[PDB]
């Protein structure tokens, strides 16, 4: 998308991730497994939950909208009524499809942002001990444990 991580430097998402939206996959001597990075996933879930709440909150619930009859010598006032009902329904249909296209683009850009933020925090952390291979994958120069893979999840990792 707009940050080149989703559909970009990482070729595709992993179906073995179910725990969260952003996560890692280790290949230790201790074996392999998918493990979500909780802080980035939960912060994204809060950002998505707040937008989901906001777009539902901003419309106020439609009260009783009842049609009005006009006689044979009130067809001008029927054409005023019809113009008012049509013109409001036009604007409200336009506002609904506007915010759907715009915010669905911004959502995919926001998730693509969070995957590059996940990659750059690991690059700045692993530094001189690892190189890039599959664009996302970091071969270590010293071979450290699944405890030390968890030290890259929480973002401590005490070795330059």
């Amino acid at each position: 998308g707009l940050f080149g991580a989703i559909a970009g430097f990482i070729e595709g998402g992993w179906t073995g991730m179910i725990d969260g939206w952003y996560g890692y996959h280790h290949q230790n001597e201790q074996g392999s497994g998918y493990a979500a990075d909780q802080k980035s996933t939960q912060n994204a879930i809060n950002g998505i939950t707040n937008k989901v709440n906001s777009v539902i909150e901003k419309m106020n619930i439609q009260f009783t909208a009842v049609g009005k009859e006009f006689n044979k010598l009130e067809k001008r006032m029927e054409n005023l009524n019809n113009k008012v009902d049509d013109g409001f329904l036009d604007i409200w249909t336009y506002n609904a499809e506007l915010l759907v296209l715009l915010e669905n683009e911004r959502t995919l850009d926001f998730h693509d942002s969070n995957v590059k933020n996940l990659y750059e925090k690991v690059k700045s952390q692993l530094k001189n001990n690892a190189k890039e291979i599959g664009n996302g994958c970091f071969e270590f120069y010293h071979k450290c444990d699944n405890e030390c893979m968890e030290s890259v999840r929480n973002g401590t990792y005490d070795y330059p």
Binding site: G13, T107, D112
Partner: protein, 54 residues
């Protein structure tokens, strides 16, 4: 036709038991209904772009 159902919203086509913000059922409403919109699809994404890597 009248039935012993009870709902917060009624329209000429039928009663609407929903909490979704928009509706495309009918413009004429009675009580607390979703706002009428002419669109056929208003689906917001909440997850990310699905690429299974298959």
């Amino acid at each position: 036709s009248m039935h012993e159902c009870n709902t917060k919203c009624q329209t000429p086509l039928g009663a609407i038991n929903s909490s979704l913000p928009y509706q495309n059922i009918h413009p004429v409403t009675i009580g607390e209904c979703p706002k009428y919109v002419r669109s056929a699809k208003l689906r917001m994404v909440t997850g990310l772009r699905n690429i299974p890597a298959r």
